[PDB]
Design a protein around this ligand. Sequence first.
Ligand SMILES: C[C@@H]1CCO[C@H]2Cn3cc(C(=O)NCc4ccc(F)cc4F)c(=O)c(O)c3C(=O)N12
Ligand SMILES: C[C@@H]1CCO[C@H]2Cn3cc(C(=O)NCc4ccc(F)cc4F)c(=O)c(O)c3C(=O)N12
Ligand SMILES: [Mg+2]
Ligand SMILES: [Mg+2]
Ligand SMILES: [Mg+2]
Ligand SMILES: [Mg+2]
Lengths: 49, 56, 56, 47, 270, 270, 264, 262
Amino acid sequence: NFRVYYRDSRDPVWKGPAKLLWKGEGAVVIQDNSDIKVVPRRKAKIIRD
Amino acid sequence: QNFRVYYRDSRDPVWKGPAKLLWKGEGAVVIQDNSDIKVVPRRKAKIIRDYGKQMA
Amino acid sequence: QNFRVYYRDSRDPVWKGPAKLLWKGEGAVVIQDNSDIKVVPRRKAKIIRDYGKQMA
Amino acid sequence: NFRVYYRDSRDPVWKGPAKLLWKGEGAVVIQDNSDIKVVPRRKAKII
Amino acid sequence: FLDGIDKAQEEHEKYHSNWRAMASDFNLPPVVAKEIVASCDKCQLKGEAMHGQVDCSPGIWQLDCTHLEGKVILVAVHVASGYIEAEVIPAETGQETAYFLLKLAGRWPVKTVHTDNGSNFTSTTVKAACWWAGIKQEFGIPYNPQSQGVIESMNKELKKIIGQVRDQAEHLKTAVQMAVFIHNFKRKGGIGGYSAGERIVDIIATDIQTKELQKQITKIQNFRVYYRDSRDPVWKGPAKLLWKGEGAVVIQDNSDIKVVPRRKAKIIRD
Amino acid sequence: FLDGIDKAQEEHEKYHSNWRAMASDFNLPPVVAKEIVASCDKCQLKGEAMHGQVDCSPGIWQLDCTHLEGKVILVAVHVASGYIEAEVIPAETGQETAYFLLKLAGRWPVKTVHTDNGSNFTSTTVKAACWWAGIKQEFGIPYNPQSQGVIESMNKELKKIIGQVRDQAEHLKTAVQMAVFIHNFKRKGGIGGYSAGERIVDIIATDIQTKELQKQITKIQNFRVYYRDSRDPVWKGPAKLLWKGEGAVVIQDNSDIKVVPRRKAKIIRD
Amino acid sequence: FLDGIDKAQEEHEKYHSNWRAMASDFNLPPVVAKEIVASCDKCQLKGEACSPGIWQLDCTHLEGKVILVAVHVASGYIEAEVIPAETGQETAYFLLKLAGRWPVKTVHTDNGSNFTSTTVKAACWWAGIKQEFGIPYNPQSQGVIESMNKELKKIIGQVRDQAEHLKTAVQMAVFIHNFKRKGGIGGYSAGERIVDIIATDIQTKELQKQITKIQNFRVYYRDSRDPVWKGPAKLLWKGEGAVVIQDNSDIKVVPRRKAKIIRD
Amino acid sequence: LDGIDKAQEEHEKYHSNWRAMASDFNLPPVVAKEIVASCDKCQLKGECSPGIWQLDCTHLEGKVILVAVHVASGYIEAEVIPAETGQETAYFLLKLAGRWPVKTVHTDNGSNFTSTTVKAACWWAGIKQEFGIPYNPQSQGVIESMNKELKKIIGQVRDQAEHLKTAVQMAVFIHNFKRKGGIGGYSAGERIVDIIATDIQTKELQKQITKIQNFRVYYRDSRDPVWKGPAKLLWKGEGAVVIQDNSDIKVVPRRKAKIIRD
DNA sequence: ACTGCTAGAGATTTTCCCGCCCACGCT
DNA sequence: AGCGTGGGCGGGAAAATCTCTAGCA
DNA sequence: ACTGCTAGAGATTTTCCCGCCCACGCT
DNA sequence: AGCGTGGGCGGGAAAATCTCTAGCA
Ligand SMILES: C[C@@H]1CCO[C@H]2Cn3cc(C(=O)NCc4ccc(F)cc4F)c(=O)c(O)c3C(=O)N12
Ligand SMILES: C[C@@H]1CCO[C@H]2Cn3cc(C(=O)NCc4ccc(F)cc4F)c(=O)c(O)c3C(=O)N12
Ligand SMILES: [Mg+2]
Ligand SMILES: [Mg+2]
Ligand SMILES: [Mg+2]
Ligand SMILES: [Mg+2]
């Protein structure tokens, strides 16, 4: 039960937060409001809470 | 039962080995460097038999 | 006249220290990390005093 | 006396050989035939 | 909470302060400073510092289209070995790429493809062809060229070799064939000094010669292992022994590829 | 000359093989393999892998124009501290850069400038102004943004902070001033937890303390070292003693900063 | 070292030298010097209301062109700015400039039309600046501000032939007053004294910053030849084998095993 | 490592070659190759070379299909060619040389395969070429019947594709995999990799022994300083090197041995 | 549910060799 | 006191690894 | 004659502390 | 035999450093 924020692809601005659905070792799938998206760990960051 | 496996671990940019294989299925391979039981998944495996074994 | 010098060496972008200054000129600086007597060019030097020196 | 080859920067090809004139720890000045140019050590090579 | 904590709140409101600045100026423990950096959603950092892992199983095969001299070049690479083929395409359309993949599967034990989301690799024709050949189709993270980085580096390499040997032949595909031959046989080094031709021979030959060997072994060998693990006195089992150790054996109980010491295990003949 | 060596020569003529290729296929020592890699002048490689050294002396100051939202922003940074000053320019013209430089020199002990070869930093007005203020000019490698990159990293930091505080102020340069203020005073950390504003105080204060202490201590202290070097019993001197060691003093005889042991040295009172 | 305490105490009794002199001379920790200068009777001066951010502000309209001149009065540093139009936004912009480069704590100005707009109020609220209007912190340097402005006008009278444009000559002139006007007790140009005062301000405020967390803390202590746990004393200097504390009024050293540190 | 003497009786009685005595007695391969070299009766000629490839033509539906055969494994592929000229064959033969190590090309001397372009490409490659000569005449009918079987596969799978060459690729895939049998019911890949890997093994042992035959061993025996030699080194061991002076297999201690450098 | 990576250049360590010479073993 | 070997050492070649970087658009 | 560098995120190592409890001193 | 104290131990917080990366047009 953590928030996540992310750097969108080919962009410098960041968005979020989103809810985790399935964490992976390189990339995570998440739901922002209706956006089931996968995003690499180097292009995003989870909140510890 | 006498082959050699090159491998690497997660979050590391270098390959390692050669370990000896101990058992194989398809998904998971167990290998042995000096005394370890490395349960390496198939996505990180490198299974060969080098042809410089003629001295070994 | 003990001082604090942060510095690095060639081919390494990691700064090290803090050495004690032993002598200074205009191009060459003599410093001392623990027992080495290092001679550092002026364009590699960092010469400071901590405000937290007041504990030491 | 050392041959030098070099990649001119903002370019992908390579040129050379040529003559060193004065070596520096990051970049070296070079005569090609009459071209006195200094070049980084990450875009060249000394034989 | 402290009044300095609320002033740090105002300071992060006005200036988006560092955690170390607030921990200095108000004598704060670092955890509340980390929370206040985490508080303002405009204070969002630059992500993590660790690269992912490109899967190295022999049944996978990477492809990519690249561009040179206005022409589209299809390159394919075995991920485990770097055996490379490359060709000119007539046009960047999915049917010709499906023909390319059928040549690939007809010449090589290909199970899985792993490409980007380009226009050529998203037709219905490649879907029909990979269903015809039984290929595991898989695509990457939609705009990350890192998961394809092996074949992108090999796109760099063959174009570097084309830069060496474009002069010997007239047209593009001739020097392309010369270059891909030079890399697949003459370029030596890497894993065992070999070129990738000998390496992919090693890979698939040891794959077959090991999997039929263990398939012949496991129908002969069958031993069932009970075990009493640590922190408990129950003798759990039976388990399938993968390999007998010297002080600790390796088994699988129901799903877990686990190690039990021989004093904590018990191998039954059947 | 073995026959396979000239055959390796024709092999590299046809294929430009690896050194390890000719070492394997013809049982060659690696020296002639490296020779034949060095033979073909079309076989020229990717060069050398080590990063150069950007100078760290307190009198130097980086400057560059950058571009954001159609506007040109002139940024200058002190190298040893990371103290930053930046403004919106009217137009990219060297007279306005000279005005910015004269503000810099009038507010800070600036000895040497260090920019790229941009159009604004090449006008004769800048050279007249820096000769008026007595500034040493210096420009970098004509297409290398690396030696001038410590400032570009700060440009990245600056535009990142502009992204944080562009919503607070209405006008652009107002938020820019707020941003450069936030970076110069609020952002703490780095070397010893400091923001750059106290670091540039620290560097210049130690500079205008240490060499004056040194100047007032060298007029008093004057000792001349006649030293016998190693592999030499002759007592060479006199040398200026820089500092007395415990087992090895440091001296300068003619131009050489030598660490000579005290048994190998001889410190005359005058 | 630990016996230099009383021979610093007699120095502050007879001569009443402040904590910097007894700190640097007796090679002491600074906190015992601050406690000795605090323990004096008549050595307790006034508070802050010292300030290094003593900034006088004065507008002038030379050649019908606006020059705003600010002075770091605490060590005699001056700078200025050429301003196109008389409005509050220009003053807010320049005051944010001064606050961005130097830690502007205090500004002394008048209540004129140029310096009294609400954008200036929003700017100094965003910076957190104490502001004065016509009041000198001390009325000594009030004539020195005027004579310094006239001295800068004389410098302009020199170097208007050194430049073509107004503001170019202005920048040349403020450079010249930043360096080419020597003097004082050690021939310093102009900025060496101001970086001295800023460095000393940073050092004393970081020592205040060091001690303001220690005053929460307590140390219950016993001694050698005694398991009794007296206190809770006040910690001066956390030591390696001997710690400096004060129980009631005596500056003592105590073995570290005889200590017990309340962390709040 | 005591199998060195009982390998000799095995190759004397039954004359099994170096692979059998290498794998059974668990030896280094060089001593097995030298014991089968000591066979005064049994020997094998080379040009054997398993890089044998056959070329064949057809013109099906007015479209040229050029068929190559790996003769050593029975592997076959084929490609669609638009026009009958030498440049197409140069492209195809450079394709085969790029993927597989071709060294032996058997073909006819037809007009469609005898331009100078393929001769220039072959000089660039270095391939021994054959023109009408079978290396051994057994598989000559096997190639013909295999091409007829591939035409039968085309007759199967022309309803599996619309275009010609698409069905051609489907068919060569099917003959690469779906046609099985033999001693293991194997695919074509599972035999062609066993064909090519032992070639790499044999040439790697050949190039391994190329350098050693320059070198000599001057050695003395135990309990005596009699410095004999120069023997031939076979296996440089960890404590006991393996040599032979005239005909005796000798394990000799390394201190008792001495190596001439060239 | 996904995932940076790979060939080349000094640089550095390490490891045989050789010769040799100083240290020892025999007439 | 001649003569006949031995052992490590250092000088050096060379061999394995570290590491590090351009570059893939 | 010149020269990549710098702020942040885990990751890992290191180090006070504390409480405590088991080991050891007092009536 | 109760009673009163100490010493390392581990659990854990947390603090320093190391490693590594986006990104600057
Ligand atoms: C018009 C002048 C004339 C000379 O050439 C151009 C081109 N240029 C290019 C970059 C650039 O690519 N920055 C990103 C970057 C990438 C890698 C790295 F190591 C360092 C880096 F800063 C600049 O920053 C920049 O100022 C210029 C410039 O000013 N000019
Ligand atoms: C039209 C499809 C649709 C999807 O997005 C584009 C854009 N793209 C960009 C690169 C690229 O940036 N290569 C240089 C590179 C840089 C960094 C790194 F780690 C690896 C690298 F290869 C490609 O290679 C590539 O194939 C594509 C592509 O195909 N497409
Ligand atoms: Mg792509
Ligand atoms: Mg690509
Ligand atoms: Mg620029
Ligand atoms: Mg730039």
